[PDB]
């Protein structure tokens, strides 16, 4: 009977809530009340990139922290050199509606996807010298929202059919599928060890997935609206999420509960991108009101504002070495801050 | 080293030339989003002229690009934001049907979206012949679904085609007024709606969308100059 299972699920959720309450005595702000603030951060634009036509949805830093990639609605994929602002590759796209891109850790591949429900893999080390599509992954139902490389042969993708998938590039088959979300999965982030990955969906829930077994380990529910961005803490035992209720929240894998929220009265717009710094002390979050904000993760006090963007900020990324942070936006401009 | 910089500069120059050509091609075409329901009959409209379907048609040597929604889910909250730069949204609704209230709610949601505030909407009240024969039959009423239809009269500025009884003219103009009531509630000058009484097999739909796109572009240019 449906009623008995509904009641059992309700009491199980109540028990989980009671356990989480019992496993919490002091907040994050209550233990860091004595450390000194980082002070005001006067970051300013160092490079500006003006090669795109339409708005920008995604960008991914290379593991060398020098190369870059960007996707725009004019069906153009462009690879930049952040040091000299020189375009290296310009990849035309079969479908002009792309909502994500990813740059392979080895630097030999780049991926993109969007409303065509297909993830396209491009090889940059071709023998002919001309970049061409190598593999097309066409097993998803809804629009593809985010993709991340594990290695040159495995890529994990999250789509609008409320499922996340693990792909085998060589065969093209969908090796493992992840189910459980009741809404559009908007973004995902990979753990530093590439053993787990979290996903933020449109049902205001974040789930911790296990790549090897394919099951769901934990579910985090503290947000009020749909989640847009997600990113692991550099330690690997925490992550931050950004939703449309103008709040950034920090969760913990071990405590299985929320620790800190980053909200201000003057902020009533959505959040589109979230990223950390190398030490994890600074949390950077792009907002809808044309500017980004820098949050002191250990004190929840804003420490800087990056207000150089004309239109909505939609993508954000921090280099592996942490030297610079890049911020694309809907005005077809990428600005590298430092 | 100098040779590496020379190579990167040469590659950048070539890529910039190709991007200039792509910009010249891109600025010429106009993008249209074809939106509707299964009963709306938009498939017949597409036939007259995967995850997403696109069609290319030219009217007076002008390139238009129409993107059918395709095989997506029924939740349009997130992917509708990608179409905030299109010239217009071709909203196709079946006027013979409660699907009409659902279409009205969808139109209201589209019209009041923050990202879609600048985008204009072209309205096609399809299935006109079916509505005409249904009203002549009289088996199904509109007053029962819409209680306001009893106290509604045909507008004095209406221009019905000859040989058409007032019974269907009043009903179709009532539906058009119901849509325009949502249309004129907000969006004061930012964007406009263009209702058209289109049949399924009408050959003038291309002309209608052509003229509506021309009007939208003219009004945008006037708005930029603060002349409107």
């Amino acid at each position, epitope marked *: 009977e449906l009623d008995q299972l509904r009641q059992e699920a309700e009491q199980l959720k109540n028990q989980i809530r009671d356990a989480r309450k019992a496993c919490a005595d002091a907040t994050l702000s209550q233990i860091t009340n004595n450390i000194d603030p980082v002070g005001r951060i006067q970051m300013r634009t160092r490079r500006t990139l003006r090669g795109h036509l339409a708005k920008i949805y995604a960008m991914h830093w290379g593991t060398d922290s020098r190369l870059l990639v960007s996707a725009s609605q004019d069906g153009k994929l462009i690879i930049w050199d952040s040091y000299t602002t020189n375009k290296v590759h310009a990849i035309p796209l079969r479908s002009s509606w792309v909502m994500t891109c990813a740059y392979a850790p080895s630097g030999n591949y780049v991926a993109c996807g969007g409303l065509d429900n297909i993830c396209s893999i491009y090889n940059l080390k071709t023998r002919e010298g001309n970049v061409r599509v190598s593999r097309e992954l066409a097993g998803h139902t809804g629009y593809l929202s985010c993709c991340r490389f594990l290695d040159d042969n495995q890529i994990v993708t999250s789509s609008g059919d409320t499922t996340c998938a693990l792909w085998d590039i060589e065969t093209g088959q969908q090796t493992t599928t992840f189910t459980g979300h009741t809404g559009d999965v908007m973004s995902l982030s990979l753990a530093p060890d590439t053993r787990l990955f979290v996903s933020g969906a449109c049902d*205001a829930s974040a789930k911790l997935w296990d790549v090897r077994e394919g099951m769901c380990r934990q579910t985090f529910t503290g947000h009020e*609206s*749909d989640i847009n961005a997600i990113c692991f803490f550099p330690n690997g035992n925490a992550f931050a999420t950004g939703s449309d*209720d103008a709040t950034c929240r920090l969760f913990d894998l071990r405590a299985d509960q929320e620790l800190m929220t980053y909200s201000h009265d003057n902020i009533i717009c959505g959040i589109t991108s979230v990223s950390f710094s190398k030490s994890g002390r600074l949390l950077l979050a792009g907002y809808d009101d044309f500017n980004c904000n820098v949050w002191d993760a250990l004190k929840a006090d804003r420490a800087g504002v990056l207000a150089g963007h004309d239109n909505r900020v939609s993508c954000l990324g921090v280099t592996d070495d942490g030297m610079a942070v890049a911020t694309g936006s809907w005005d077809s401009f990428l600005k590298i801050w430092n | 080293q100098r040779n590496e910089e020379k190579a990167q500069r040469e590659a950048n120059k070539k890529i910039e030339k190709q991007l200039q050509k792509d910009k010249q091609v891109y600025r010429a075409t106009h993008r249209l989003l074809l939106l509707g329901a299964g009963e709306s009959g938009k498939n017949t409209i597409v036939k007259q002229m995967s995850g997403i379907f696109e069609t290319k048609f030219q009217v007076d040597k002008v390139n238009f690009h129409m993107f059918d929604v395709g095989a997506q889910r029924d939740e*349009r909250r997130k992917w509708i934001q990608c179409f905030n730069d299109v010239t217009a949204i071709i909203f196709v609704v079946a006027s013979s049907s*409660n699907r009409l209230q659902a279409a009205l709610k969808l139109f209201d949601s589209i019209w*009041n*979206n923050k990202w879609l505030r600048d985008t204009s909407v072209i309205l096609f009240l399809n299935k006109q012949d079916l509505l005409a024969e249904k009203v002549l039959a009289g088996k199904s009423k509109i007053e029962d679904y819409f209680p*306001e239809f009893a106290r509604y009269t045909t507008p004095e500025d209406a221009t019905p085609e000859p040989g058409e009884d007032p019974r269907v003219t009043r009903a179709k103009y009532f539906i058009r007024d119901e849509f325009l009531r949502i249309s004129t509630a907000s969006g004061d000058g930012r964007h406009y709606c263009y209702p058209h009484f289109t049949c399924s097999v009408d050959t003038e739909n291309i002309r209608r969308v052509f003229n509506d796109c021309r009007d939208i572009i003219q009004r945008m240019h006037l708005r930029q100059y603060e002349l409107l």
Partner: nanobody
Amino acid sequence: QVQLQESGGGLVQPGGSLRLSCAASGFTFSNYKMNWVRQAPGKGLEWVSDISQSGASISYTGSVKGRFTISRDNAKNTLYLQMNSLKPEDTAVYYCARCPAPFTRDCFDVTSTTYAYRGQGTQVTV
């Protein structure tokens, strides 16, 4: 998390009066537009009514105009629905859906299936 639970409903003879209450938890109830959605047996989801953040603007579907009234009190985080004359075709399941985003006028996907922010619903029969 977000939890919407409906109250009221049951079996009432035609012409009777019914009261529907929705209890909201897990979010600031004063920042979201609220909706009522009805699913007739054998048919799809149908929208019934909506009320603004402060209750200033109220809208109803045509079939129930002047017969159902909706109300909300932000202090108690409760959404109401008053029924006056249950016609025989009103038998269906009623959900108190929520507008997906705060401080906005557009409420997409409320009548769509498998919507995230919807209650279990109550069954009314006549």
